Amino acid sequence: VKEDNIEAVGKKLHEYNTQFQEKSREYDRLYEDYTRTSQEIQMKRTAIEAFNETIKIFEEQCQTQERYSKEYIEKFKREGNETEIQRIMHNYEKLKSRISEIVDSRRRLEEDLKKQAAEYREIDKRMNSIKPDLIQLRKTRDQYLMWLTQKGVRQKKLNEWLG
């Protein structure tokens, strides 16, 4: 406690409490963001697992297409049906082209997750710089509250400074 006069300490208790209520409101808004970003990040990470799962299935399909076409490309060639082979291969060209679309979409999410993982870490840095200030304002406010209680200040006056 810096000063030693009842009304002067009382004004500082009000100022320090206002400064405390303010800084507490800032940290609560930043913990709202940290919680929100934590949820959005585990969403983007499961959506990345989903793209990987989708691509796996698209790759299993190419495996199937390659082993399964083998027996039929050889059979339609001997029958002069170079038309059926052309149809099978162009359908495969079609499949592979879609894989490249899905791959690119998976890549776009990896960019968002990298940008949002950097947003989260900056949020945590912005919170960890507010915590020493927030904790100090609490301790200060409490010491002024005690000082005036010890000095015999009435609850009505104490409530008037806090509220």
Partner: protein
């Protein structure tokens, strides 16, 4: 858009891509696919449509076999619109259940496999089997047993009058109305109808009337008697029910290799310290050994050894190595993150080697203590971004060491002036001089004070293995404590596994009805658990599989917290296990979860559509969204999540609205042509846990009172959190707010004419007393005409509770409202006869509550696990000791209550 382009993968390797409606069912899509596939190569080789099944990568990133082809693509919701035809056969039974669990529990089962933890995998193996066994064992049992399982009795906690009761039969629209005794058993009520037929189940409900109880002891009959209405029942036997049914040597000090830190985010002008202490519950096992200061960076390096004042052999079974990363300004301190670790693993083996602990963020609170021993002993699931500490436990012997088995533990464990000095002490903080006495006379505590076990367990020196053995020896021979005492032993302060097992041993005496009243506290206490497999989980699951209603509320207590990272793994594992053993209810919970998912989107629409157009415009714009086939089907015909014995049948889209409030909640109405007009409120935006705790507490009071023959005609409406700031609230029909009524005795006149007005006046007086006593005890302030509601019957009740035990922490006084006293007095200025009868109810209600005071303290103390800010410390619990004047005598309490009563009346006059 109505349509979406879908990618199709045929088993021949052929790829087809065409548009389909988002509201189309899979069965229809398979037909559109076969129609297009014929014009693409290799069609001749495909088997018939019915020989194949669709596969998709769902929202949870898991492969899903789409067996129910009656589901619409929008309901299926695949991640990308990609479908693969796969072979239909291949033990589809497990494949369907495993998939439907992942959707229902809100987490993919593959997320459990991904972890690569034997603890997780052993839990799944033991728990799913035990649950599957109980489910099969359930199917074996008779028609009577299964009826007690699915539809357990809903009884009330007396005179013998005449009741006119209706009866009917399944399919038959012919009713045989006959009178029967109020105290008559349902065996007689059916026999009197069996004879009446030639010359069980409430219709429109999943409530049955059976067992050796009198007709009036049932909740439906009780409501029918007071509300006047005649009970309508449907006689059913076996046929329809079966259709429904189908080493101590290691004396070297404890060491820890604090090696590295990872992804740390702080101000570069500071240094970084890592404080570490050992804990068993809330007590320290030794001194808080700290690290050296290192410059602020993302990846700090210490490679420092931390030695604790405790030799390895003295470590208890439930020893916790707690960490906290602090940012200090070289030479107020900033707590960055914290992490706890068990020294012994689930298999009893003392952990050895490198352990990477993904740290949890520190939150600044009133008790800014360096360490957090109460926090989860699990890792942060956000392994992507979360800071971490690289530690390494060193090797101690060539072979791994396990904590001594019970046989080895119980082996090492085997005046008269002080006898009075113990009596005075065990009569709630015991100092060092008191702790040492209680411990010496520990054999006298087991002999003369079995109820004081909790005091004794705390005095025990858990940091010296000699002391620990002596205590556990007594525990293994301790007398069975009452349920009230057992409740206290569930608290974090008693972490020893043997204590939990003794506590559960005593909780096994609970009737399904009493267990229901503590279910919320019991679910919360799981957050205090260290291992996944524990006695409490087993108990909770065993009970949930024995009773469908308990199972239902266990599902929703766990589900509504699946977003909280600290419980998500634990709660997820329990739900999967509950689901494997309750496949029937699993279908009900799916119908509920679907309607809830639609209402969130319907609420999200109305929230935005209110910030544009007015109230009746948004109302009809809402109704159109509700009238959609995929919406209306999902919201229609489902069991009520608030009370699963209530059937929410036909949605009344005209009656459906939203409330002009802080979060704009949806008013959804239901009509039933077989039952009367049930309603529900879907609220999204603010946490409904506090309101559920308050209402649960008021329900307990209501039961405790009813037990002493005092019915204060209370309205305990349902409130159920279903998820992250999501929930439901039961619509109390034929009721409005005091404020809206005063735009009071005229409202009762226009709703109770003749001799009905004196009935309402008694309902008002009875409910007023109860809600006055309840709001005083719970410290519920800010009670005004906007949050107080009256029912057309005369019953008064409190709505929307936000502020708990003072916490607007200032004492809330007993409050009597002028308007209410006026109504109690029937309109008179002085009506001593009526007013003193009312004062008697208040004094009786308060006295009953004091008798069960410790139940409320124990229940609230366990609720500290919930993380509610208005219930976080011992002072919040202290509020109840003071409100219930527990540190006084019944006579001293009653005269202070009377003083506060008289002053509540005097202050009522001032306003």
């Amino acid at each position: 858009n109505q349509s979406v382009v879908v990618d199709f993968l045929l088993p021949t390797g052929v790829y087809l891509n065409f548009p389909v409606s988002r509201n189309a069912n899979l069965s229809t899509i398979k037909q559109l696919l076969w129609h297009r596939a014929q014009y693409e190569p290799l069609f001749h080789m495909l088997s018939g449509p019915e020989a194949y099944v669709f596969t998709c990568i769902n929202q949870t990133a898991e492969q899903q076999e789409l067996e129910d082809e009656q589901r619409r693509l929008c309901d299926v919701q695949p991640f990308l619109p990609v479908l693969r035809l796969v072979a239909r056969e291949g033990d589809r039974v497990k494949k369907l259940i495993n998939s439907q669990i992942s959707l229902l529990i809100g987490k993919g089962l593959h997320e459990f496999d991904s972890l690569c933890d034997p603890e997780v995998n052993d839990f799944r193996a033991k728990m799913c089997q035990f649950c599957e066994e109980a489910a099969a064992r359930r199917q074996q049992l008779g028609w009577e047993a299964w009826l007690q399982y699915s539809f357990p009795l809903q009884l009330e906690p007396l005179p013998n009058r005449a009741l006119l009761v209706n009866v009917k039969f399944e399919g038959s629209e012919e009713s045989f109305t006959f009178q029967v005794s109020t105290k008559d058993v349902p065996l007689a009520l059916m026999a009197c109808a069996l004879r009446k037929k030639a010359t069980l189940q409430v219709n429109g409900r999943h409530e049955y009337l059976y067992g050796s109880y009198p007709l009036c002891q049932f909740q439906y009959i009780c409501s029918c008697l007071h509300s006047g209405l005649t009970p309508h029942l449907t006689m059913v036997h076996s046929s329809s029910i079966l259709a429904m049914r189908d080493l101590w040597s290691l004396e070297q000090p404890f060491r820890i290799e604090l090696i590295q830190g990872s992804k740390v985010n702080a101000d570069e002008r500071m240094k970084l310290v890592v404080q570490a202490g050992l804990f068993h519950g809330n007590e320290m096992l030794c001194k808080t050994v700290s690290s050296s200061e290192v410059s602020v960076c993302s990846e700090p390096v210490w490679k420092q050894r931390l030695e604790f004042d405790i030799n390895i052999c003295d470590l208890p079974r439930m020893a916790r190595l707690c960490f906290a990363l602090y940012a200090v300004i070289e030479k107020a301190d900033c707590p960055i993150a914290w992490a706890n670790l068990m020294l012994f693993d689930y298999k009893d083996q003392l952990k050895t080697g490198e352990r990477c602990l993904y740290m949890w963020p520190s939150v600044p609170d009133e008790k800014g203590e360096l360490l957090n021993p109460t926090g989860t002993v699990r890792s942060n699931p956000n392994t992507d971004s979360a800071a971490a500490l690289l530690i390494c436990l060193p090797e101690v012997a060539p072979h791994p060491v396990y904590y001594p088995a019970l046989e080895k533990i119980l082996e090492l464990g085997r005046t008269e002036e002080e006898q009075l000095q113990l009596r005075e002490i065990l009569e709630g903080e015991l100092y060092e001089h008191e702790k040492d006495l209680v411990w010496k006379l520990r054999h006298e505590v087991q002999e003369h004070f079995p109820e004081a076990l909790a005091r004794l367990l705390l005095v025990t020196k858990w940091n010296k293995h000699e002391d620990v053995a002596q205590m556990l020896y007594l525990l293994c021979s301790w007398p069975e404590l009452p349920v009230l005492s057992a409740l206290e032993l569930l608290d974090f302060s008693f972490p020893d596994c043997h204590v939990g097992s003794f506590a559960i041993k005593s909780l096994r005496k609970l009737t399904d009805d009493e267990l229901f009243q503590y279910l919320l506290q019991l679910v919360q206490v799981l957050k205090y658990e260290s291992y996944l497999d524990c006695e409490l989980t087993k108990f909770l699951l065993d009970r949930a599989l024995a009773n469908r209603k308990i199972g239902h509320f266990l599902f929703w207590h766990l589900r509504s917290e699946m977003h909280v990272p600290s419980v998500a793994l634990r709660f997820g594992l329990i739900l999967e296990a509950y689901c494997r053993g309750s496949t029937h209810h699993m279908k009900v919970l799916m119908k509920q979860g679907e309607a809830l998912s639609k209402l969130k989107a319907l609420n999200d629409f109305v929230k935005l559509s209110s910030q544009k157009t007015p109230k009746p415009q948004t109302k009809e714009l809402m109704h159109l969204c509700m009238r959609q086939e995929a919406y209306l089907e999902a919201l229609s015909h489902l069991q009520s999540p608030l009370d699963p014995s209530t059937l929410l049948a036909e949605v009344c889209v005209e009656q459906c609205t939203f409330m002009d409030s802080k979060m704009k909640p949806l008013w959804i109405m239901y009509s039933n042509e077989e039952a009367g007009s049930v309603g529900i409120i879907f609220k999204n935006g603010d946490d409904l846990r506090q309101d559920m705790l308050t209402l649960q507490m008021i329900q307990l009071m209501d039961v405790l009172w009813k037990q002493e023959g005092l019915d204060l005609r209370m309205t305990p409406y349902g409130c159920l959190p279903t998820g992250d700031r999501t929930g439901l609230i039961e619509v109390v029909l034929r009721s409005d707010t005091i404020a809206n009524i005063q735009l009071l005795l005229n409202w009762l006149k226009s709703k109770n004419p003749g001799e009905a007005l004196d009935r309402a006046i008694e309902e008002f007086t009875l409910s007023c007393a109860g809600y006055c006593v309840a709001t005083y005890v719970l410290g519920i302030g800010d009670r005004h005409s906007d949050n107080i509601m009256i029912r057309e019957s005369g019953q008064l009740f409190h709505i929307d509770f936000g502020h708990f035990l003072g916490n607007f922490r200032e004492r809330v006084p007993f409050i009597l409202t002028y308007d209410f006293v006026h109504v109690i007095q029937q309109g008179k200025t002085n009506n001593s006869e009526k007013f003193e009868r009312f004062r008697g109810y208040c004094e009786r209600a308060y006295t009953i509550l004091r008798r069960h005071g410790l139940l409320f303290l124990h229940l609230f103390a366990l609720m500290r696990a919930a993380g509610l800010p208005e219930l976080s410390c011992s002072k919040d619990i202290q509020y109840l000791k003071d409100s219930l004047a527990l540190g006084k005598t019944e006579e001293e309490a009653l005269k202070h209550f009377r003083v506060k009563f008289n002053e509540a009346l005097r202050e009522s006059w001032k306003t």
